[PDB]
Amino acid sequence: LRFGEMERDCMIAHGAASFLKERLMEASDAFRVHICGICGLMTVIAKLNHNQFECKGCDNKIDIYQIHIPYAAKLLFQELMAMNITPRLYTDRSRDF
Amino acid sequence: AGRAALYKEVYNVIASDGSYVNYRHMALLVDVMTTQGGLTSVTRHGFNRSNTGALMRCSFEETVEILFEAGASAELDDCRGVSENVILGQMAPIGTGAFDVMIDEESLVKYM
Amino acid sequence: LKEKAIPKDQRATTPYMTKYERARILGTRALQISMNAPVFVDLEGETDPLRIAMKELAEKKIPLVIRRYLPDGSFEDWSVEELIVDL
Amino acid sequence: IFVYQNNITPSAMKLVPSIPPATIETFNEAALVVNITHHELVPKHIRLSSDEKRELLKRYRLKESQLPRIQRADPVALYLGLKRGEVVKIIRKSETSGRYASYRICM
Amino acid sequence: MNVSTSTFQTRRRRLKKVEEEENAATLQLGQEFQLKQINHQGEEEELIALNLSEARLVIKEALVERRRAFKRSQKKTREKELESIDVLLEQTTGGNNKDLKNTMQYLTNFSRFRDQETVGAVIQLLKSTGLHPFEVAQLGSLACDTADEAKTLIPSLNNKISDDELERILKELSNLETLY
Amino acid sequence: LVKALEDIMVHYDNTTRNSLGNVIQFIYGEDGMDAAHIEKQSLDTIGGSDAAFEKRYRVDLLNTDHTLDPSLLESGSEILGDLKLQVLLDEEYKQLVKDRKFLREVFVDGEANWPLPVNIRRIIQNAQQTFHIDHTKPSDLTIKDIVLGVKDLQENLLVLRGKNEIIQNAQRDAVTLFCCLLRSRLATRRVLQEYRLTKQAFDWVLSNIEAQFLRSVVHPGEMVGVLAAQSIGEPATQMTLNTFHFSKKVTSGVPRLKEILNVAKNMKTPSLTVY
Amino acid sequence: GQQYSSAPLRTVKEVQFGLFSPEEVRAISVAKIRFPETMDETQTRAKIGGLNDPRLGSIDRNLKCQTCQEGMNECPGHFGHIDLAKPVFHVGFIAKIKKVCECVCMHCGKLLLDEHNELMRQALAIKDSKKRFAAIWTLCKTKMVCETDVPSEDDPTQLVSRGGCGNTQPTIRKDGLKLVGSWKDEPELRVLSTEEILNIFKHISVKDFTSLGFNEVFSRPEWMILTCLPVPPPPVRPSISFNESQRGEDDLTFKLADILKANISLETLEHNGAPHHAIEEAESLLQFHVATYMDNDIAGQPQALQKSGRPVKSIRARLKGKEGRIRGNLMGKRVDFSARTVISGDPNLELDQVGVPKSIAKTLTYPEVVTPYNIDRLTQLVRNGPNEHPGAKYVIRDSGDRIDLRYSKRAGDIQLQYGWKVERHIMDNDPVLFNRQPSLHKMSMMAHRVKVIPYSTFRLNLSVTSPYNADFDGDEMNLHVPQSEETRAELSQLCAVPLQIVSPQSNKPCMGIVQDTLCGIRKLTLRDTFIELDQVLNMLYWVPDWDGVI
Amino acid sequence: MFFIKDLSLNITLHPSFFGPRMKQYLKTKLLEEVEGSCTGKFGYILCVLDYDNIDIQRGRILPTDGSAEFNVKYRAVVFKPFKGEVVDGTVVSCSQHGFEVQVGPMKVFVTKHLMPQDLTFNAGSNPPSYQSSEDVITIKSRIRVKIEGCISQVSSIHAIGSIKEDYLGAI
Ligand SMILES: [Mg+2]
Ligand SMILES: [Zn+2]
Ligand SMILES: [Zn+2]
Ligand SMILES: [Zn+2]
């Protein structure tokens, strides 16, 4: 069934932070990708079982993180990339507030 | 004094149908349309051309066009808008998400 | 920075617990109880994790602490024990 | 302050910023007939000293940005001769509290 | 790669290339082994290097304190040193850590100064030299005779000290040299 | 409406901000109260003849026909002529008068019925029932018990907590209107002649006002961006319009609201109203 | 993902937007895309070393990924590249590429207007990233000569040399996907080569472009022109491969093959016997395809039609809201643990209840963790089976392996273990989100208490008819089932019907007594209206919290 | 060399351990994950120092599951070898290609060619050795090697070293 933008509005109104995440992830397209701590893309060749992670053209075999995002977000990121846009994802803050 | 006239009109559109909306609701919308020293429209042109998140703004009206400039101007989305977390499948800093929860080993050992 | 932590003396937030905090402490504790975490209250024949957590909360035997962040990032840590539950 | 009747030639206008620290103001005689500040809807605006402002930002954990803004050209900002940066405190009546105080930073 | 260990040095590495440099005793140690280190108290602390002799007393002490703590919760000389250190390890170590048993046997078989008293006085002597912590370590770790033996094995020194001065220090070191 | 307000929340500093941390309101709804905990109540000191105000609020222990009769309170007999106590009732009425002038500055038309946070009428009602108050026997309250008790209640009605002038003077402003209503409904003449409250009844009424007020304040995390948006957006959908089927015929409802939000320069019905 | 990864689990705290330096695209690439083919080379109906190819990801349910050797569910996909025979303008920047040319000297790469100008100092002052580029352009557009010398701040009589050549500048106009200048008897008219536009941008000073809208690290103007075109892995363009003999490649696969075909024509044409005014024909074709892959719904140009007469879905078109990724796949989603049926009014339901039909309750489940409290009851639900009402559908062992209670040979002798989860049926009094679209209210979605009943309708209390806006005129509603002991707490402790009773919309209550009850309450509460004992006693019994005092 | 570094591992604890011996369980899981462990950044983390005062800090309860993440700030003794670092060590293995020396936790290998010309392999010896006019290098001999360069691997740091230069050789 649909948990549309409007269905999201109400949840935000309710302050039901956890139920919204649950609905948007665990209940539909939650997914696990590997980020590069340097270049911030899903470039990581993740051979998990051999415990091998590498971002060639970064020589990054250390700075690797796993993140949980919707598959549509992953798709969107790969879609933005196909149009030469880099949606770099970083797990640490720079600017502050 | 422009704010005053704005609320007055917004109120008289709602009160024409007889219906009642508590001050604060129309007041907020009016306050929002105004804090940026002048009349900020509730359009694709107005609020959507703010300094707010890149992903946040793209979530309405210009989308691809917003994200194209996002790359060409090297924008850095703060990830504090509701939208951003909704897109990133993360718990938004909304109500139940506006604070953090910690276990104090001290109080824990105190109970047992 | 660790100037981010606001000290116990000089704390401005409500001495009362937010409707959202209650819902989240109750939930968080229920989920933990539910995944066989140690229970600090005498469960008087109790079996539902939410009810057990509500029993934990009424007795104020919940070992959690609310980090209330401010618009700048600075926070006030309040304990479940020290928060008034008027709600 | 200069109270001109109809117009000031663009040649004369060149001389306005020409002599700092002194600041020159241009006011049309026709606009001044009615005091806008006096109107029903226009609340009381109060210029804040460098200290008054510093304290405000410190007490609300604010950046100059985070503050609600007012245009340098705002009828009340011209009236009070607000320069950029200068914060104004606005006191209006409220239907929820009795009084409410907002602040507006210049632009 | 895995859930690994962080440090107190702050990485600013945003996109920028892996421009990392060489590691030689031209005292170009890592960025992770810089002279100007940052302790867990957030303050700038100078790098800590250890002579085998000094290092053995550190591990032996910390492993001794762990035994003490493990027995607290439990409620509610030469080759004979090798015998004993292996008993402390059988107790406080995870066994799987062969590296520490390998290390404790090396340090025990290569310590220049055995007792605490000595090591501290060695440290006191090399303190004054003002030399880099790695050179100071190497001098305590490696036994030399000629000022050249030293200045050759520790090339980092070179001009940093007089020949005679470093040769006087080396004589003081051989005197302090424990008779196992 | 909703996409323009998503990110607006009440932060733990009682301030209204967005995803930039930019201040919109300085306390949610200029009062810092949760919309849900409000009811229309009337401000009695606003309307009526100055004569009727006098009759309903003035206590004068220095005039034989303007004191509280001992039928009202136990001290009634000994209370007459107390100059030191009349100083309290003088300062009390002098503030009550100040209230009336202020309210008339705010609600210029003389509209008394405004939505406020504590239903004081019901608190007093429930007190009378709770304590089986007899409107016959004299009260055990002192003039200090009331005057000084109501003064001390006002200090415990906190919206904003902060040890500095900016926040404290902001607290004073948030509770400005509510307190008018308090002084209005808890004046000495009223508490003794109207509601025939005991020491018990009154102290209970006070604790209840305090605790009921403290309930009524907004909850940091209150996602008021969306709240407000939907609270304008849903009544908008229930609109018939355009402007009946025929004073002036101004374009109203759904089309006029479209006109507002767009901040349209060429509006359908531009009009001036000259007084 | 679904498998254990050693890697640390973090959250995205920042999104850094940038552009791909061709250099990055090469490093990041796992395959140099070479052939506009899909597979079937050397006969074998299996991926070619050109396009798709295992170097990127698997088409088949193979296990082989040949890069991470992980398998379709786990593998995200790996990017490739096509080194382009000539540079092409990125369709989406074409105007900003034009406006940067309108700002800079098309001969030495110098920002046409120096800090020597007072209005330039005013524009350059702007701390804002974009408003700066906007103010700079409005001032630089009207400048048509590169100044070798200019009047100083000291005295205007004795001019100071600011460096840079003295060439005249063209009046730039956009012609489709090309840029044309007009220098100054009779003005000079020539097209501006991507190559030339790129060189000028390469020669733009770091200080210059950072003063323009750009960034030295993530967004250099030169990267707005494409030389290395990244090839998205198969999961972006899925081969919807039906049957053994047939395939069924995605639109984007064709557009890329179209780009690849166009590239090789140009690559061979320029290398071999170049007629030169035919090279500018095949170049314009590669410039079209690369622009039209990213945007097909271009301002006054022919839509790049697919064989069928279909327009070809551009990547822009994919994310373009209401149904694009953003609005339709991210702000909104279709979700598991959801139900929808016709709603019927019920007077015998408590306000905050929701009559769930048995069939629906036997379909939707809840992951209860096997704990000493429930172990006893849960084994009996597992026992009951997935067909009896208070039953269970799956037992999920710690080993992350699903037991289908409908088929498992052990379905009868499962001995539960603490920690394992029992995905049991929704039973009475589980909190659930009930909803009636359009959702223009906090009230349009409320938390209700399940009450498993017979008959195919959702039964709701009539006084809650009002905030939902529901009629029984054939009206239908949604139900969502929370799966965490945490999200149940969210619903129960924040969005339950009893809580929502008094709305903050109008500081009044949003539910009251309606219709039959309203009509009947007037009739009951009258001076005339009196009741004989027989019925008084029944009326008293009907009130459940009756004191038992006549 | 042999440094003392201020490091910090992050651990996620499942709710079942939110009992009183929590700091006790937490300190142990640190020692499990960190002791013995070899990196590249720091190399061999051999022994965790000051067990009684390990800084646990407050544990943030994760959002969808009840587990809590703590940053365990600590101090430890580390071995990070380098090029140029002249090390004393004992021979472990010996072949036609050269001899390997054990130095603390890690092995250093000496190539036949990174040895003086006068020293030469002898297959016909139990155990095999490298013999020179003067000294003989075998399975248990103490050597002073100059580490020529390192190779970091999973749980190891290997290195190649020379005894060709002066004051380098048998001890
Ligand atoms: Mg209908
Ligand atoms: Zn990378
Ligand atoms: Zn792969
Ligand atoms: Zn030039």
UniProtKB/Swiss-Prot annotation, chain C:
Principal subcellular localization: cytoplasm
- The entry's keywords: Cytoplasm, DNA-directed RNA polymerase, Nucleus, Phosphoprotein, Ribosome biogenesis, Transcription
Q: Which GO terms describe its molecular function?
A: DNA binding; DNA-directed RNA polymerase activity
Record carries keyword Nucleus: yes
Question: Where is region (Leucine-zipper) located?
Answer: 43-64
A GO cellular component annotated for this chain's UniProt record is: RNA polymerase I complex
Which residues are the signal sequence here?
none
User: Where in or outside the cell is it found?
Assistant: Cytoplasm; Nucleus
Q: Name one GO biological process term.
A: tRNA transcription by RNA polymerase III
Miscellaneous comment: Present with 6090 molecules/cell in log phase SD medium.
Q: What does the similarity note say?
A: Belongs to the archaeal Rpo6/eukaryotic RPB6 RNA polymerase subunit family.
> Subunit structure, per the record?
Component of the RNA polymerase I (Pol I), RNA polymerase II (Pol II) and RNA polymerase III (Pol III) complexes. Component of the RNA polymerase I (Pol I) complex consisting of 14 subunits: RPA135, RPA190, RPC40, RPA14, RPB5, RPO26, RPA43, RPB8, RPA12, RPB10, RPC19, RPC10, RPA49 and RPA34. The complex is composed of a horseshoe-shaped core containing ten subunits (RPA135, RPA190, RPB5, RPO26, RPB8, RPB10, RPC10, RPA12, RPC19 and RPC40) where RPA135 and RPA190 form the DNA-binding cleft.
Protein name per the record:
DNA-directed RNA polymerases I, II, and III subunit RPABC2
Q: Which organism is it from?
A: Saccharomyces cerevisiae (strain ATCC 204508 / S288c) (Baker's yeast)
Which residues of the full-length protein are shown here? 69 to 155 of 155
Swiss-Prot record, chain D:
Taxonomic classification: Eukaryota, Fungi, Dikarya, Ascomycota, Saccharomycotina
Family, similarity comment? Belongs to the archaeal Rpo5/eukaryotic RPB5 RNA polymerase subunit family.
Protein's cellular compartments: Nucleus
Task: Give the multimer and partner information.
Answer: Component of the RNA polymerase I (Pol I), RNA polymerase II (Pol II) and RNA polymerase III (Pol III) complexes. Component of the RNA polymerase I (Pol I) complex consisting of 14 subunits: RPA135, RPA190, RPC40, RPA14, RPB5, RPO26, RPA43, RPB8, RPA12, RPB10, RPC19, RPC10, RPA49 and RPA34. The complex is composed of a horseshoe-shaped core containing ten subunits (RPA135, RPA190, RPB5, RPO26, RPB8, RPB10, RPC10, RPA12, RPC19 and RPC40) where RPA135 and RPA190 form the DNA-binding cleft.
* Name of the protein in question: DNA-directed RNA polymerases I, II, and III subunit RPABC1
Task: Give each disulfide bond as a residue pair.
Answer: none
The domain of life for this entry's organism is: Eukaryota
Organism this protein belongs to: Saccharomyces cerevisiae (strain ATCC 204508 / S288c)
From Swiss-Prot, chain E:
Pfam families referenced in this protein's UniProt entry, alphabetically: RNA_pol_Rpb4 (PF03874)
- Coarse class of the primary localization is nucleus
Per the record, the GO terms for biological process are: DNA-templated transcription initiation; mRNA processing; nuclear-transcribed mRNA catabolic process, deadenylation-dependent decay; positive regulation of translational initiation; RNA-templated transcription; transcription by RNA polymerase II; transcription elongation by RNA polymerase II; transcription initiation at RNA polymerase II promoter
Q: Which Gene Ontology terms of cellular component type are present? A: cytoplasm; nucleus; P-body; RNA polymerase II, core complex; RPB4-RPB7 complex
Q: Which domain of life is it from?
A: Eukaryota
Provide this UniProt record's keywords sorted from A to Z.
Acetylation, Cytoplasm, DNA-directed RNA polymerase, mRNA processing, Nucleus, Phosphoprotein, Transcription
Q: Where in the cell is it found?
A: Nucleus; Cytoplasm; Cytoplasm, P-body
Oligomeric state and interaction partners are given as: Component of the RNA polymerase II (Pol II) complex consisting of 12 subunits. RPB4 and RPB7 form a dissociable subcomplex associated with the 10-subunit Pol II core complex. In exponentially proliferating cells, only approximately 20 % of the Pol II complexes contain the RPB4-RPB7 subcomplex. In starving cells, that enter stationary phase, RPB4-RPB7 is associated with Pol II in a stoechiometric manner. The RPB4-RPB7 subcomplex probably associates with TFG1. Interacts with LSM2 and PAT1.
UniProt similarity note:
Belongs to the eukaryotic RPB4 RNA polymerase subunit family.
State the protein's name: DNA-directed RNA polymerase II subunit RPB4
UniProtKB/Swiss-Prot annotation, chain G:
The source's domain of life comes to Eukaryota
Quote the PTM field.
The tandem 7 residues repeats in the C-terminal domain (CTD) can be highly phosphorylated. The phosphorylation activates Pol II. Phosphorylation occurs mainly at residues 'Ser-2' and 'Ser-5' of the heptapeptide repeat. The phosphorylated form of Pol II appears to carry, on average, one phosphate per repeat. The phosphorylation state is believed to result from the balanced action of site-specific CTD kinases and phosphatases, and a 'CTD code' that specifies the position of Pol II within the transcription cycle has been proposed.
| UniProt binding sites for Mg(2+) 1 | D471, D473, D475
Q: Where do the annotations place Zn(2+) 1 binding?
A: C65, C68, C75, H78
Chain intervals for the UniProt region annotation (Rudder loop): 296-313
Q: Where do the TM regions start and end? A: none
Task: Give compartment(s).
Answer: Nucleus
Q: How does it assemble?
A: Component of the RNA polymerase II (Pol II) complex consisting of 12 subunits. Interacts with DEF1; the interaction is direct and serves to bridge RPB1 to the Elongin complex in a DNA-damaged dependent manner. Interacts with the Elongin subunit ELA1. Interacts with the Elongin subunit ELC1. Interacts with ASK10. Interacts with ESS1. Interacts with RTT103. Interacts with SHE2.
Domain note for this entry? The C-terminal domain (CTD) serves as a platform for assembly of factors that regulate transcription initiation, elongation, termination and mRNA processing.
Task: Give the record's family classification.
Answer: Belongs to the RNA polymerase beta' chain family.
Protein name, per record: DNA-directed RNA polymerase II subunit RPB1
The gene name on file is RPO21
